[PDB]
Design a protein around this nucleic acid. Structure first.
Ligand SMILES: Nc1nc2c(ncn2[C@@H]2O[C@H](COP(=O)(O)OP(=O)(O)OP(=O)(O)O)[C@@H](O)[C@H]2O)c(=O)[nH]1
Ligand SMILES: [Mg+2]
Lengths: 86, 405, 98, 283, 127, 14, 360
RNA sequence: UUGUAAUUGGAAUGAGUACAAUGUAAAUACCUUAACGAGGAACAAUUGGAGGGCAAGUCUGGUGCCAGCAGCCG
């Protein structure tokens, strides 16, 4: 589990760049800050600040990807089969 | 959520359901716990238990029914404590925004048995249904009648002068010929050996104590700080006298209160249906301000049609609901804010509209039709989004192409 | 891991908390009124023939509940009860469906 | 000659110097100026000592037409031969050939710097940082710890320098003690030199040397002369007196059987005071 | 598993007591009422002492470091005081060093005439 | 450029 | 409609508090009976500065100049340059910006120009070492005041750059119920267009007063000469007593006039520092208004600060009354349990303020 | 003689609905079975991976008309 601190590539000009898909996340177990991938910018819209994100093993150096946000699958949101509860 | 409890009711006998599963439902509600929600824990809100108009009927006849009324609403407070002083800005859903003319607490009309037992126990030391519709210095500062100079002399010039008042140089010099009386503040720098040990222990604590001064997880560490601060709040309030306590914290949640509002529309009093709830919600300073709201908005998945720029659309921000004309935009690879004609079919887009401002991260939904006549059969939730920014101006721009041959 | 979540501050007072708001929401004719009457009888042993607006009742030694029947035909209500409802009882007609 | 090329270590050096905006910096071995431009950025003014006129000319060219041009001053000469201006902080990546003398000069400046960041060879830095009882504890350690306190900032690698040298490097911080302890430099150095010929032998063995006895006897005779008491001045007149003085002081101080390498500041200070009591002055 | 940490040691105090006894017998090498009765201060002291000795939290990491640092600091302060006293008594006994021969000469062991003239001139100046 | 993103302003009737 | 105030009293505070609260205010009868009625030039310049760092704010100054209508907008900040009239030094305008800087949509980057010191307003060193640390205690991690050029009165010519990188939602809750143990005394003795001797005599002057003390005394000598030294000769000192334990600072400062003795000023400022520490419990008198205001705009929790019975003077009372008028918050004071001193604990409930201007 | 059909013909059939019977302590279900139950047989099979192409569209770089990124936005 982790906390979304800031979306680093949100200002990037090139759409769907690798930078655009990187999000800084604070690991809640130890408080260590790490970076994670989101499948795509369309999925990046769902992720906003201060939400629960479940991370899984995967721009070298980024080794995590988001699989659930706020307790809901990112894929489920991206296929539009669920709505993120706030 | 997957695995959610779902109760099953078979039939109705004597206008009542079978007792067996009603017990199951009742027990489930009894043992239930509630998560802390962001909006609920940052605003004070109240559901009106009863509604009463205090307007003198003499005024109603002389000026006529059209005169604005004064109304009293009673109910249990929720969320953050409501400030005791009058003048607080609140919004009633479907009515508008008003100012608290008066506020006072009343005895609880439906005391819980545990509460009544304590009061009865207090009496020694010296109903289940409620359905009405169905010279201390501190005082001296806050008595404005006494001038501050008069205050000071009793219990013993301006901030433009940053340097604080000092006595004359010579008398100050005579006062500080010796460094005594302040030695305690400064660090010091066969039986006496133990005496030496104690001072050095105190110095060591003073020099490095903090670096030394554990919970397993970072989460528990965050919770501990919150709990510790909450504990401090309780201790200060428990030392605190009940009347002065109400003056500082205000009216805490669970207090049954009377709120009186002036200048309410008369239609609210005349067109009152007890079925429709009356919801009062406090407003933060930003909620009062009006301006341009920048938000990320997307067409709802189950809405049949895409939305259009400059199309009326009813928003639900915070306590308030209102109709505006939003403009849907695109970042153009984060270069310029280009106006769109319609919302993306299956993706978010930046939406700009004018209305009451709200703090960022305030979610909202959108609806195009609220009247029953035009409901039809389609889904009425049209758009969903999150407010991204608040501003008084914005620079949307459209592509204009000049043609020649 | 599933234990850990974002820290937030719970502002519920430590003593004499307010009754929880229970919103009975459903399409017209599902049985919102009868459900409220059934529960009210169980916790209080008395039957309310007619119910309007909030009704506060004792449910335990130190627990209270306020029941509000949302107008099924009004969307505007559904928005603001949803804003203040601590618990929502979604009445669903099994025969008809969602 | 060797030149650093890692920017991060230079940034760390300038940062941990903690240059206040009203400080003047004595920056030895300016090099290409990588350190100098940053130090000019956050300093009142910088005084630089360059051995190579060409290299200082390159520095002037680099800083010319810049806002920090007026702040910089360059001195051309030998760091030791030059007489230096007042300075608050000393930051150097000078060749280690002048490493040991440099420190003492900073210690013996009329107004010593409050803080200096110095780069040295690893072994030399450890010997500076060595504590009593350590293997590398030596005369340098005791002397500098009398006149200052030395701490370790970084270990700087071989690869950072080009062409790579044959030894590692390190960066340390020196803080000269204000007020200076009121002990003669000469007496302290003399005692330590007599005691540190073989630091892992007994101090009595150190004093057993014939040359040490001769020097101590001559110094005792000189001290008697200064006190106006007459003295014979023959070679072996006071040998039997100085030897028994030494034995008595060594026995009473209980330092006779303690190795020099395992003796701290206070043990040496006690020995010095006792020797002054009995009348022997070392240097 | 015998002495493993338990979720609530207070709930099973008596159990833990047995363990201590077992330890006291197992590690001794290294160290070297009728309830069924018709009718039923020192016992309160027994309760207090047994429960206190049974439960004493093991001192923590930060407590360890605090103890070591307190010891080092306080010894350092004592050393500073002793140094100050010795240095004062040194200022009591002080002279110049120009005439005294430095210990730097310890290695030489033999001398030229030039210094001998210098020494001869020096001792003449002294008288 | 000062006036591009302004909505208030000083109204001095002195 | 408008909260009404009387006179020029607490003009900067009332404006600043209006900004933080977002409540419109009215100030009337400003120097009505004076021969030259209405606002002074520097007060108008201060309003201009407020307009520059805000957006949506509307300000009216009356035809006679004796009445002000102020409607706050949002704090937006940005990069700007402000020319400070000679009537006041730079510290006059910098001080209110410290209140508003952490709570902006963009970082504050303001270049102030004018006289850099005076007898009545916060100096450069007062801000750098005396107030900004209190902000750092409140959560403002990054804040800097760079002195590009010193300008002494009367011709001034000094330039300073204020940069506040830290943008925070609201100040942290204070819990300081003890008397900080101050570990060392530091200070800065500065001079312009004059010989270095004055600074040394000054540091010598302060040292005599403080020599009897049991802590270190090290005063920096910052002599300014040349192009960056301003247009006028001047010299002043700021002495700061620092408590490394909890990062608290107590400071006193003043500047010298032509013909005054450098030693005497050093002695006077040293004595004034001994006064402030005698009167202070957790913060100095000159730092208290900043401390109180930030607590009021903290989260909705009870913050505790220890204050001495000396700090409760006229200025303290009016500050609380103005706060109550705008924010409706009441500061509660309780006695400490100790008998050695007669300090009191000021307990303030925050209003739950949050910096909504910043983008997320 | 290959590929494609919201083309077209009448035959078969169970998911489901349901008389009855069987089953069962009583029931549900299974096996049976009158009678209904198919052309988009809308009685609307999924989960992953790979590769295109399109503009008066957008961004970036430059030995012209190009290349990269990418393109739910013209
Ligand atoms: N057979 C049967 N009838 C039910 C059931 N639940 C409700 N009903 C009937 O549905 C009708 C409506 O009951 P209400 O309690 O008024 O439902 P409601 O939610 O109040 O409906 P409205 O207030 O009109 O919007 C009553 O005649 C009930 O007998 C059920 O499970 N079975
Ligand atoms: Mg009903």
């Amino acid at each position: 589990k982790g906390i979304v601190l800031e979306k680093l590539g949100i200002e990037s000009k090139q759409p769907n760049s690798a930078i655009r898909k990187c999000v800084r996340v604070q690991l809640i177990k130890n408080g260590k800050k790490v970076t994670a991938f989101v499948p795509n910018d369309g999925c990046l819209n769902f992720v906003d600040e201060n939400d629960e994100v479940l991370l899984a093993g995967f721009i070298p150096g980024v080794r995590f990807k988001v699989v659930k946000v706020s307790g809901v699958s990112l894929l489920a949101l991206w296929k539009e089969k669920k709505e993120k509860p706030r | 959520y997957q695995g959610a409890k779902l109760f099953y009711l078979s039939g109705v006998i004597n206008g009542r359901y079978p007792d067996r599963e009603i017990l199951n439902l009742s027990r489930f509600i009894s043992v239930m716990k509630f998560r802390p929600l962001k909006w609920r824990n940052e605003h004070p809100y109240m559901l009106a238990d009863r509604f009463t108009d205090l307007t003198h009927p003499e005024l109603i006849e002389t000026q006529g029914l059209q005169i604005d009324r004064k109304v009293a609403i009673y109910g249990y407070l929720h969320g953050t404590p409501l400030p005791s002083a009058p003048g607080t800005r609140v919004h009633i859903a479907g009515v508008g925004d008003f100012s608290v003319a008066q506020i006072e607490k009343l005895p609880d009309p439906c005391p819980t048995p545990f509460y009544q037992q304590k009061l009865d126990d207090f009496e020694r030391e010296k109903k289940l249904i409620y359905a009405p519709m169905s010279w201390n210095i501190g005082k001296l500062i806050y008595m404005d009648n006494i001038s501050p100079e008069e205050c000071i002399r009793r219990w013993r010039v301006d901030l433009e002068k940053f340097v604080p008042y000092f006595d004359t140089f010579e008398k100050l010099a005579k006062k500080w010929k010796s460094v005594d009386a302040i030695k305690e503040r400064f660090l010091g720098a066969r039986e006496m050996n133990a005496a030496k040990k104690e001072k050095l222990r105190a110095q060591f604590e003073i020099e490095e104590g903090e670096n030394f001064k554990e919970y397993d997880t970072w989460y528990e560490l965050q919770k501990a700080k919150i709990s510790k601060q909450l504990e401090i709040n309780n201790i200060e309030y428990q030392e605190m006298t009940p009347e002065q306590r109400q003056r500082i914290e205000g009216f805490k949640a669970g207090s049954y209160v009377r709120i009186v509002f002036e200048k309410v529309p008369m239609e609210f009093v005349k067109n009152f249906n007890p079925k429709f709830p009356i919801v009062m919600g406090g407003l933060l300073p930003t909620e009062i301000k009006f301006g341009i709201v920048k938000a990320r908005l997307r067409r709802h998945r189950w809405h049949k049609k895409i939305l259009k720029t400059n199309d009326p659309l009813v928003l639900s921000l915070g306590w308030r609901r209102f109709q505006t004309l939003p403009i849907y935009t695109t970042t153009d690879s984060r270069t310029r804010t280009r106006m769109l004609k319609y919302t993306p079919e299956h993706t978010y887009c930046n939406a700009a509209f004018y209305g009451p401002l709200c703090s960022p991260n305030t979610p909202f939904c959108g609806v195009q039709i609220v009247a029953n006549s035009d409901t039809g059969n389609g889904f009425r939730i049209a758009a969903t989004g999150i407010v991204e920014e608040i501003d008084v101006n914005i620079e949307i721009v459209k592509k204009l192409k000049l043609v020649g041959f | 891991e599933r234990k850990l979540h974002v820290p937030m501050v719970d502002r519920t007072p430590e003593d004499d908390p307010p009754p929880f708001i229970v919103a009975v929401v459903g399409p017209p004719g599902t049985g919102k009124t009868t459900l409220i009457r059934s529960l009210v009888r169980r916790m209080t042993k008395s039957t309310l023939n007619d119910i309007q607006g909030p009704i506060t009742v004792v449910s335990g030694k130190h627990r209270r509940l306020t029941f509000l029947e949302c107008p099924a035909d009004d969307l505007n209500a559904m928005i603001d009860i949803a804003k203040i409802a601590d618990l929502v009882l979604l009445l669903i007609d099994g025969n008809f469906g969602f | 000659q060797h030149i650093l090329k890692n920017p991060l270590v230079a940034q760390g050096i300038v940062d941990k110097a903690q240059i206040r905006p009203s400080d003047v910096v004595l920056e030895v071995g300016p090099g290409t100026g990588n350190l100098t431009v940053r130090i000019l950025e956050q300093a009142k003014n910088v005084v630089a000592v360059e051995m190579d006129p060409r290299m200082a000319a390159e520095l002037t060219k680099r800083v010319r037409g810049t806002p920090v041009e007026k702040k910089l001053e360059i001195m051309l000469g030998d760091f030791m031969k030059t007489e230096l201006p007042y300075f608050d902080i000393c930051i150097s990546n000078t060749p280690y050939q002048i490493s040991s003398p440099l420190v003492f000069k900073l210690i013996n400046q009329p107004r010593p710097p409050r803080v200096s960041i110095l780069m040295f060879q690893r072994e030399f830095a450890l010997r500076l940082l060595a504590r009593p009882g350590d293997s590398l504890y030596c005369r340098l350690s005791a002397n500098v710890q009398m006149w200052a306190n030395v701490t370790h900032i970084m270990k700087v690698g071989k690869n950072n320098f080009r062409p790579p040298p044959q030894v590692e490097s390190s960066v340390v911080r020196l803080e000269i003690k204000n007020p200076r302890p009121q002990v003669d430099y000469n007496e302290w150095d003399g005692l330590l030199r007599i005691v540190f010929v073989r630091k892992n032998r007994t101090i009595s063995a150190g004093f057993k040397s014939t040359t040490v006895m001769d020097i101590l006897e001559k110094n005792y005779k000189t001290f008697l002369a200064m006190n106006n008491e007459m003295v014979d001045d023959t070679k072996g007149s006071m040998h039997d007196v100085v030897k028994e003085k030494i034995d008595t002081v060594l026995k009473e101080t209980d330092l006779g059987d303690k190795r020099a390498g395992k003796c701290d500041q206070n043990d040496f200070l006690r020995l010095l005071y006792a020797f002054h009591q009995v009348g022997i002055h070392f240097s | 598993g015998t002495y493993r940490k338990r979720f609530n040691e207070k709930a099973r105090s008596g159990h833990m007591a047995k363990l201590k006894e077992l330890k006291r017998i197992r590690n001794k090498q290294f160290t070297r009422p009728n309830a069924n009765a018709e009718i039923l201060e020192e016992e309160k002291k027994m309760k207090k002492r047994k429960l206190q000795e049974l439960f004493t939290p093991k001192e923590s990491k930060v407590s360890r470091l605090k103890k070591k640092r307190l010891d080092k600091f306080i010894e350092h302060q004592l050393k500073r005081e002793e140094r100050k006293t010795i240095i004062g008594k040194l200022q009591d006994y002080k002279i110049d060093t120009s005439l005294l021969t430095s210990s730097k000469r310890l290695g030489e062991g033999r001398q030229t005439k030039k210094e001998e003239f210098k020494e001869a001139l020096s001792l003449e100046r002294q008288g | 450029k000062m006036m591009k993103n302004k909505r208030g302003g000083v109204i001095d009737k002195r | 409609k408008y909260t009404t105030f009387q006179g020029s009293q607490n003009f900067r505070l009332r404006i600043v508090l209006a900004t933080l609260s977002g409540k419109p205010i009215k100030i009337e009868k400003i120097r009505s009976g004076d021969l030259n009625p209405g606002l002074k030039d520097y007060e108008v310049s201060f309003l201009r500065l407020i307009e520059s760092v805000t957006n949506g704010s509307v300000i009216e100054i009356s035809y006679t100049g004796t009445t002000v209508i102020y409607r706050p907008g949002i704090i937006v900040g940005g990069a700007s340059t402000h020319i400070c009239p000679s009537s006041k030094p730079v510290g006059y305008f910098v001080e209110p910006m410290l209140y508003l800087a952490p709570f902006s949509k963009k970082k504050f980057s303001i270049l102030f120009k004018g006289i850099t010191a005076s007898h009545n307003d916060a100096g450069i060193e007062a801000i750098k070492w005396g107030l900004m640390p209190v902000m750092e205690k409140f959560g403002v991690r990054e804040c800097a005041l760079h002195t590009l050029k010193r300008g002494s009165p009367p011709l001034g010519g000094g330039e300073v750059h204020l940069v506040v990188d830290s943008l925070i939602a609201q100040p942290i809750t204070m819990h300081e119920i003890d008397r900080p143990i101050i570990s060392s005394i530091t200070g800065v003795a500065y001079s312009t267009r004059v010989s270095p001797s004055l600074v040394n005599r000054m540091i010598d002057g302060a040292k005599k007063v403080l020599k009897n003390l049991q802590c270190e005394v090290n005063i920096t000598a910052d002599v300014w000469r040349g192009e960056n030294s301003g247009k006028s000769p001047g010299w002043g000192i700021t002495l700061v007593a620092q408590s490394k334990q909890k990062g608290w600072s107590y400071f006193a400062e003043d500047i010298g006039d032509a013909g005054s003795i450098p030693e005497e000023l050093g002695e006077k400022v040293a004595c004034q520092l001994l006064e402030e520490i005698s009167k202070s419990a957790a913060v100095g008198r000159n730092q208290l208004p900043l401390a109180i205001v930030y607590m009021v705009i903290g989260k909705e929790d009870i913050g505790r600060l220890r204050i001495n019975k000396e700090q409760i003077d006229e200025r303290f009372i009016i500050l609380l009354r103005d706060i109550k008028k705008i924010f409706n918050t009441e500061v509660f004071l309780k006695p400490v349990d100790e008998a050695d001193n007669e300090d009191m604990i000021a307990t303030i409930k925050g209003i739950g303020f949050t910096n909504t201007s910043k983008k997320i």
